[PDB]
Each structure stands twice: as structure tokens, then as C-alpha cells.
Amino acid sequence: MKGDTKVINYLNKLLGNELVAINQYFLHARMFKNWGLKRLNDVEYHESIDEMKHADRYIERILFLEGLPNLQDLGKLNIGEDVEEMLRSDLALELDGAKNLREAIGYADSVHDFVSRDMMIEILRDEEGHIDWLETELDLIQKMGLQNYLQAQIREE
Amino acid sequence: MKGDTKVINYLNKLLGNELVAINQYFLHARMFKNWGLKRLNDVEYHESIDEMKHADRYIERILFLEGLPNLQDLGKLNIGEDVEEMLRSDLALELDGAKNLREAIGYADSVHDFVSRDMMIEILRDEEGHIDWLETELDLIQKMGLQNYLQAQIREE
Amino acid sequence: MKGDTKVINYLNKLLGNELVAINQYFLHARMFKNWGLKRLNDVEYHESIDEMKHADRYIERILFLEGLPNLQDLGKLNIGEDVEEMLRSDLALELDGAKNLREAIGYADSVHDFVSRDMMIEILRDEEGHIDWLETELDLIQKMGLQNYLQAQIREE
Amino acid sequence: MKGDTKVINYLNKLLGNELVAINQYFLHARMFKNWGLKRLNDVEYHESIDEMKHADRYIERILFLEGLPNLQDLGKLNIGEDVEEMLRSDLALELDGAKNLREAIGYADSVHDFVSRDMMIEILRDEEGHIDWLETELDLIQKMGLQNYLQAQIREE
Amino acid sequence: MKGDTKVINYLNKLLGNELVAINQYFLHARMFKNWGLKRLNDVEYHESIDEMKHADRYIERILFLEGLPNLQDLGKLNIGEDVEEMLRSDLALELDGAKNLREAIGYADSVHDFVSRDMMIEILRDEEGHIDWLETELDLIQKMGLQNYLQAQIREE
Amino acid sequence: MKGDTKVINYLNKLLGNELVAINQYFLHARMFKNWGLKRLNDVEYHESIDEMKHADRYIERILFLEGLPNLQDLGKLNIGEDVEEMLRSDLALELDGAKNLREAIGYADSVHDFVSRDMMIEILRDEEGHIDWLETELDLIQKMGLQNYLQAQIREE
Amino acid sequence: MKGDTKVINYLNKLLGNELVAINQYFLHARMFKNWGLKRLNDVEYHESIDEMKHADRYIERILFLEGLPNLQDLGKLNIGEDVEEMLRSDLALELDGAKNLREAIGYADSVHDFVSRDMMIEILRDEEGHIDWLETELDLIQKMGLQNYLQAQIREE
């Protein structure tokens, strides 16, 4: 079913955000795993999987709308080198992605693509959950100090 | 069964104490939850539920005694802005309510309302348990230091 | 994640509506229970629980958006003295709350807070369910007469 | 297998009767449901389903006999505005349908389409069951009075 | 609860679209069944059921809003005489109905009937799924040729 | 119980038809089995079994009515040499048998042997099902072509 | 444990190959899904998952060897526009990756990194399995023709 060209463009932009996050979350997860921070490996791995599900949804929606999903272009990752930098980079990426989502959701409504909008709102709700988790972890690092924080990650939850 | 007017007045005062505590414990729980202090969310949530049960018992008793339960007036909440402050506020509220319970229990005895007294004694035993828990947590904050204390709250027990 | 100030104000207003309804439904339920109208006790109790869930969602959303939930102010309850008067008062409260919800949902869309909007639409759906139930009960009182209506409430369903 | 032209015509006429009854029973059920008359929603819904099964049998028989099922033409519904009026309308429709069935059953026999006749006799037996139920309910409204009758419908049976 | 008159008119228009589709899908299903195309009978039958569910939701919503559901008027069926023709007709009907849904969804938003809107968005998501299925089947007829396509339908999947 | 002589004569004629069909269906089944067309073996074998059941019913009915079942005379088989020929021959036999059944059913009614008639109507319903199956397969051969049709028979259904 | 710099460089090159294949296989899978070719969706999806597992192994190995996994650079995808083109492109990518694996396996042996080598040989065995599958499907398209081939993909295996 032929979709709106700019809706497809938004879907590809958001798909692009998801592809960066999939890789960044996954690399962070395995960095945490290497360092023995099992709990952070588990959560970040889960976040990567969640972004994969989102990417899949964008891909299928774009195809249904008769557009071409773009998995070729990959945006900039910012890996970081310590736990705080890594989590802050994931947070910055989530915030940029949420801004893109809000713009796309408003636009989809205006051209009456209510199903694409509904999909995007569910994904945005997911992203805000990730934002909440990242903000909370960053605050905990400050509240309990980095040494206690790292200790609290070595066992799975 | 027409009850003693002053007993009903005490039950409404105690109901009022419970209504403040229900809201204060519940808000504290969700603040703790927001901050990632899962253990404190769990305990404060269950304390809110306990106070709800007490409130229900007062409402039912007042209605049996043919009085009018007052759920309209709400006493002063003191939320606090950090963990120690919030727990100290909960403890102060518990102590104030225990003072009112002791008065009411003595009075109900003087007018031979032994069933209302029996109900309030069970509720007071409940509140002294909350007092014990709050006192103990506050002591632990001082003994292990705030950073260790916060770390100990992030996993459910 | 810092939310829009007016959205947070709306959420607090709606939270306020839920807080009135929680108490009014709960007192109505126990009044019905006292009178032996078991069926009405069961329904109104479950409606009170439903509004508690809504209140919880508002409290959590407000805290996420870095606002301060207001559980201190409690709006006007209208208890009523007979079954029809009590149900009419619950209906009036539901209808006032639905108006507030519609205004907030429109505004959340305007400022692109689609996740707060999604939450409120779910809550509004729940509220219209309560309205449906209340309207239906009030019509039944008129159609079968009060004596038959009361007889119909003494067994749990 | 090429069927008799007038047998196919009768089947389409009967199918036409069932199509009206499907919609009228269904709308009646949901009207009853809206009014809180659960027992009447349940019965009328099941009657709508029964007529759907009959419609299915006619459609399949017409196609087997190489005719064209007519689902385009819809005869007159008579909804009515109160319980007695609605049930009387359903009864009138059943009685007209039964007349048509009797005529078709005699004709099918005359042209030796004994399998179409056998199908129609089973359907007619079903319809007379509905007529029995409707007559019984209408008599009950008169014997116990409308207020008692409505009270008897609020719980599923 | 007295609804918006124009929302009710849209709900009746959409209900009308559903009623045509219910009949058209069901007849197509049984035509496929008669031809031995079991897979196509199964899918089209379930699409008919899906449209019945949508019709039910519209009927219940309209009654809640104190309108009168129109099951009397039935729009034009376009049955068709061969598999491709039939599937194309179902697709054309889906596309017309989606256009009506988009219009109604936009309007309900303007009058703040967000629950009616939410219901219609879910139904639109369902219809776009049917559109996807129909488009895909039509393309398959072209890609594998009609003889292979028909062979692929004779066993249930 | 002494039956009507001409009813018994009809029952023997019908039994005769069944006896030819039992053999023709069984041989067809095993020819298809030899050819590797497992699906056709399965169905035709089942049809032979069905005709055995019918023959058993006629034999038992004739004996109850104090007549002599005739299993000695066997009418003409037309085996055919390819799938289409074989299926057409089964269809022609079914059609001839159905005309005989119709005559016998009308006659039984005229002499008030309603039990023999009832038995024959059930059997006729069964034969029309075989007719529907054969007509459908023959059409499928034409629509998908013989090569696809044969391919579709090699696996069991 | 500090690894050999050129081994890490090989591991990143191989990881790079896997990253292209993950995306190319996944997009191919969802294109096939959109087209109704369920069998090809299932297999290609599985191949994408397999390449994710390989990528995970490289990432973990690189980190153990104290290098930096490169998930930022993504090589050229060649999506293609029809089934044969898409499959040939997957085959070409697999063949390019296998040549890289062979080079890396020989090199790892020369610097005595036998564990990295062992990991890569297992992965190469997996890729040759994908190569066998793709070569086989491409031959089948030719042997049975595209129309039969597409028909064979519409059901899950």
C-alpha cells in the first residue's frame, strides 16, 4: 500500500537511530561483560535486543508502505571509555532519538498515517523507559560513589 | 448499633492519621522507585497498603457504630527531599499516630467499647512494627554510611 | 527527564480527581456493605482500586518528568445519603474528571508528550467504562423500581 | 450439481430472512447489553449466531446447486424501542420466516430435492425453538410484570 | 453518555463499511470452499469474522454514546466471478473503508472523543493487515501464475 | 415385519447401485495407489467404504422387511483409463444412483414407509456429498492443469 | 590478555563482514516476508541470527585480546531486486567472507593464536553451510523454474 514519501523518510531516519543504538548498546554490553559487570551486560544486552525489535518494526512498516529500508548508512557511535561516559552516551543517543520520534509522530498524524503513528508512540514509550533507566543509573553512580556502584554490578539481577 | 459519639470521633481522628500515612508512604515508595531504590519502594509500598487496611477497618467500624467516616479532611503531609529526611518524616508521623491510638484505646475502655479497643490494639501493634522498622533503617544509615546504605537498596529483598 | 510544566500541572490536576474518586468510591462501597448490598460493595470497591491504579500511574509519570506529585490537596467529596444519590454523585465526579482528561490529552499532543497522552487515553477509556456502569445502574433503579433494585444487590455476582 | 431454479429462489428468500434476523437479533442483544440486561444479551446473541449458521447452510447449498447467493438485498428490520416491543418484533419475524420455510419445504419435495428439504426441516425445527422461547418470555413479562421481568435479566443464567 | 452527533454518524458509516465486508468476505469464502480452494476459504472466513468483531465494537460504541446503530442500510457488494476479481474487489473495499477510517479518526480528535478514536485506530491497524494480505496474494497470482496459485490453495495451511 | 413389495424392489435396485460403486471406487483407489497418487487412493478408498455402509443399511432393511437382498447381480462398471475418465465415470454413476434414490424416496412416501424413506434421504445426502467432491476435483484438473493436479495428489491429505 | 595487533585487525575485518551480512540477510528476510515467501523469510532470518552470533564471538574475542571492536564502519550492501538477485548477492558476500576467513585462519596459526584460529574455523564451517544452502536454492530456481520455485516458498518449512 503506497505510503507517504516523507513518512517513509521519517521511518528510515528512525530506523537509522535504532541501528546506531543496537550496535552501541551491544558493544557496551560486551565491554561490561569483559569487565565483569554482569548486571550492566544483562541490561544493555536487553536494550540492544529491544532496539532490534524496533528496527524490525520500522523495516516491515517501510516495506508495507512500498519504500526501501536503508540499512546501509550508519550514524556516528560514541562508545566512551568508562562506565559513566558509556551510559551518558547511551542517554544522549536516546534523547536525540526521542526528539526525532516526536517530530515524526506529529507529522504522521498530519498526513493521516495513524497506524505508523501508533507504532511510533509504542516505540517512544519504550525509549522513554530506557531513558528512565539510564538517568537512574547515572544518578546512582553519583549517590553511592563509583566504587560501590561497580561492586553492585558484579552479580546478575 | 449506635456507638459512643466520642469513640466515633476518635476513630475518625485515627482514620485521618491513616489517610495521611497512606499518601505519604505511597509517594515515598514511588520516589524511592524513581531513584532505583527498589528495596525501599517495596517496603514503603507495603506500609502504604498496611495503612489502607487500617483505614478500611476504621471506616467499617464507624459505619457499624452509625457514625459518618470523614475521608474529606486530610492532615499535613511532610514529604522530605532525601532518604533520611523522608524516613524520619514517616517515623514522626507514626509516633504522632501512636500517641492518638493510646488515647483512644484508654477512652474506649472507659466507655466499655471493648471491640473498638481490641481493633485499635491490633492496629497499634502494627504501627509499632513500622516504628521498629523505620528506627532500624535510620540507625543503619548512620552505622554503614549513606553510600553503603543506598547501595543496599537497589536490589529487591 | 524534564517534562513540560503545564503537562505536569495537568497530571497533578488529574491525580487530584483520582484522589477524590478513590475515597468516594471506597466510602460508598463500605456504606453499601454495611447495608447488605453486597453487589454494590464489590463493584464500587473495584472502582476505587481502579482509580488507585490510575493515581499510581500519574504519580510515577509526574516523578519521571521531574515534577512533584501533589497528594496533599483533596477536592470536594459529595457522599450522598441514599443509593441513587450516591451513584449520581460518582457519575458526576466521573464526568467532571473526563472533561479534565480530554483537555489534558489535547494539550499533551500539542506539546508532543505523546507518552503522557497515551497513558491518559487508556485512563479515559477506563473512566468511560465506569460512566457506562453508573448510567446503567441508575437507569435500572428507574426501570425495575428501588425495591427490586435493592433486592438485586444483596447477593454477590 | 445444477439445482432447480425455483428451489434456488426459495433458498435465497430464506437466506434473506436469516440475514434480517441476524442483524435484528444482534442489535437487540447489544441494546439489552447496554441496558444491563445480561441474560437477554446472552440469549439474543446466541439466536443471532444460530441464524448465521442457517445463513451459512443456505449459502453453501445455493452454491452447490450452482446458483448465486444473494447477500446484497436486506429486508426490513423492525427494531422497536422497549423490551416487549423488541421481543414481539423478533417473534413476528420468526413467524414470517416459518411461513416461508413451510412453503419451500413442500415445493422442494414436489421437485424431489429431498436433501434441500431435509436441511430446511432442520432449520425450521430450530426456528420453532426460537418461537417457543420468545412466546414464553413475552408471557412471562405479562405474568410477573415488567419490573420483576427486568430484574430477572440482570444476571447471566 | 451523550456522544457527539457527527462522531455517531461516522461510526454508523464505518459500521456500514464493515457490514458490506462481512457479507462479501463470507460469500467469497464459501465460493472458494465450493471450488476446493480450502486455504482461501479459511483466510476469507476469518477476515469475515474479523469484520464482525469490528461491527460489534461499532454497535456497542454507538449505543454507549446514545446513538442508533444502522444495520438496515447495506452498501454495494461487488462479488466478482474469478479468484483475482474477487480478491481485487475485497482490496478495493478495504481501501475505501480505510479512507473513511482516516477521516473519522481525524474528526474524533477534533471533538476530543479520544476513546472512539483509539478504537478506530486499532480497527484501522487490522484493516491495513487485511490490505497487506490481499496485495500480497494478488502479487503472488502474477508471480507464480494462476495455475500454480490455484494449486497452492487446495490444502489448508 | 412384512414390507411393501415395490419398496423392497427399490431397495434392491439401490443396493445394486451401491454394489457397483463399491467395486468401481475400490479399483479406482488401488489404481491411483499404484500410480503413486496417494491422496486419490485415500479419498476413493473412503468413498468405497461409505458405499459399503450404505449397502449394509439396504441389506439390513430388506431383511427386516422380509425380502431377499440381491447381491448376485452386478451392474456395469465403467473403469476408464486416466484420472479424468475415472473421476467422470464415478460422477456419472453417482448421478444415476441419485436419480434412482429420488424415485425410491417419492415412492416410499406414497406407501407410508417413512423409515425406509428416512434412511434413503440420509444416503442421498451422502451421495450428493460425493457428487460435490467429484465435480470439484474435475474442475480443479481443468483450472490448474493435469500436471499440477497430479503433483497435488502424491502426498496424503 | 594482550593479543597480536594483526589478529585483532583480522577479527575486526571479519566482524565487519558479519555486520554487512546481518543487515543484508535481515532485510532480504523481511522483503521475502512482505512478498509472502514465508520459507525464505524463515531461512534468511535464521542466517541473520547466525551472523549475529558470529559477530558476538568476534566482539568478545577482540575485547579479551584488549582491542577495540569496530561496529562503526559498515561495508557495502548489495540488496538486489528479485529473488535470484538477492540470493546471488548473499552468496557473493559469503564467498568474499570465506576468503577473508581463510587468510585470517592461516595468519592466526603463524602467530600461535590457536584459540582465535579455532573460533574462526568453526565460523568458517558455518559459512560454508550457508554457501551450500544458497548454491542449492539458486540451482533449484533454474531446475524447477521461477514460478514453481516461488510457489514452493509460500508455506513455512
Numbering used by the authors:
A (entry chain F), B (entry chain C), C (entry chain D), D (entry chain A), E (entry chain B), F (entry chain E), ...: 1 to 157
Give the published text.
Ferritins are iron storage proteins that overcome the problems of toxicity and poor bioavailability of iron by catalyzing iron oxidation and mineralization through the activity of a diiron ferroxidase site. The capacity of cells to store iron in a bioavailable and safe form is a central feature of the strategy nature has evolved to overcome the dual problem of poor bioavailability of iron and the potential of the free metal to catalyze the formation of reactive radical species. This function is fulfilled by the ubiquitous ferritin family, members of which are composed of 24 subunits arranged to form a protein shell surrounding a hollow center. Bacterioferritins (BFRs) constitute a distinct sub-family of ferritins, found only in bacteria, which contain a markedly different diiron ferroxidase site. Unlike in other ferritins, the oxidized di-Fe3+ site of Escherichia coli bacterioferritin (EcBFR) is stable and therefore does not function as a conduit for the transfer of Fe3+ into the storage cavity, but instead acts as a true catalytic cofactor that cycles its oxidation state while driving Fe2+ oxidation in the cavity.
The EcBFR ferroxidase site is flanked by two Tyr residues (Tyr25 and Tyr58) that are ∼4.0–6.5 Å away from the nearest iron, and by a Trp residue (Trp133), which is ∼9.7 Å away from site FeB. BFR also contains five other Tyr and one other Trp, which are located further from the ferroxidase site. We sought to determine whether these aromatic residues are involved in coupling electron transfer to oxidation of Fe2+. Site-directed variants, in which each residue was substituted with Phe, were generated and the mineralization activity of the variant proteins was determined. Rates for the five other Tyr/Trp variants were 70 % (W35F, Y10F, Y107F), 75 % (Y114F) and 85 % (Y149F) that of wild type BFR. X-ray crystal structures were determined for the Y45F, Y114F, and Y149F variants. These, along with previously reported structures of W35F and W133F BFRs and Y25F and Y58F BFR subunit dimers, showed that the substitutions did not cause any significant changes beyond the substituted side chain. EPR studies of the EcBFR variants revealed that Tyr25 is the site of radical formation; only in Y25F was the Tyr radical not observed.
